[PDB]
C-alpha cells in the first residue's frame, strides 16, 4: 500500500458518462443530449502528448 507500477500505457479505456435515471429501458433510443450536466470530450488526433 503506497506503491504503484513504475509506468502504464493502457490508453484505450472504456470511459463513459452515466445517466442517473436509466433504470428500465433496454431500448436502442437516441436519448436527447440536453438533460446531462456533463459530456465526455473527444481525444484529439494531434501529436502524442
Amino acid at each position: 500500500k503506497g506503491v504503484h507500477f513504475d509506468s502504464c500505457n493502457l490508453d484505450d479505456l472504456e470511459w463513459r458518462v452515466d445517466d442517473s435515471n436509466a433504470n428500465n429501458d433496454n431500448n436502442g433510443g437516441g436519448g436527447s443530449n440536453q438533460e446531462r450536466s456533463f459530456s465526455l470530450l473527444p481525444l484529439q488526433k494531434t501529436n502524442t502528448p
Binding site: 433504470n23 428500465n24 429501458d25 433496454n26 431500448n27 436502442g28 433510443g29
Partner: protein, 98 residues
C-alpha cells in the same frame, strides 16, 4: 428479485424436425427488432438494484404468475432455498391483487 413466472408448456414429444429452428430464428430476429422500442414492457424486466423500483407497461384484464428469485450476495441463485417464508403485497387490491 421479482420476475414474471414463465411456466413451462406441456412436454409434448420431441420430434427432430429441423424446420423448427428456422421459425425460431425468424421470431428471434423480429423480437431483436422489437427489443429496440418495446423496452417499457413487463417482458423487458432489467435486473434492478436493491430498492430500485421500475415502472413497466402491462395490459389490463388478466391473471399473471410471479416468482421471488433468491440469491446469495456473491450474486448466485441457490439450488434450493425452500426454508424461507415470503410476503406478497400490492399498493391497491382493486387495480392488482394476489
Amino acid at each position: 428479485q421479482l420476475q414474471v413466472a414463465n411456466l413451462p408448456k406441456d412436454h409434448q414429444i420431441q420430434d427432430s424436425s429441423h424446420h423448427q429452428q428456422i421459425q425460431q430464428q425468424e421470431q428471434q430476429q423480429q423480437q431483436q427488432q422489437q427489443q429496440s422500442t418495446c423496452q417499457d414492457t413487463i417482458f423487458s424486466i432489467k435486473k434492478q438494484k436493491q430498492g430500485e423500483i421500475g415502472t413497466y407497461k402491462i395490459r389490463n384484464d388478466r391473471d399473471i404468475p410471479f416468482i421471488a428469485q433468491v440469491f446469495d450476495d456473491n450474486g448466485k441463485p441457490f439450488t434450493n432455498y425452500s426454508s424461507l417464508v415470503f410476503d406478497w403485497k400490492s399498493s391497491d387490491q382493486t387495480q392488482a391483487k394476489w
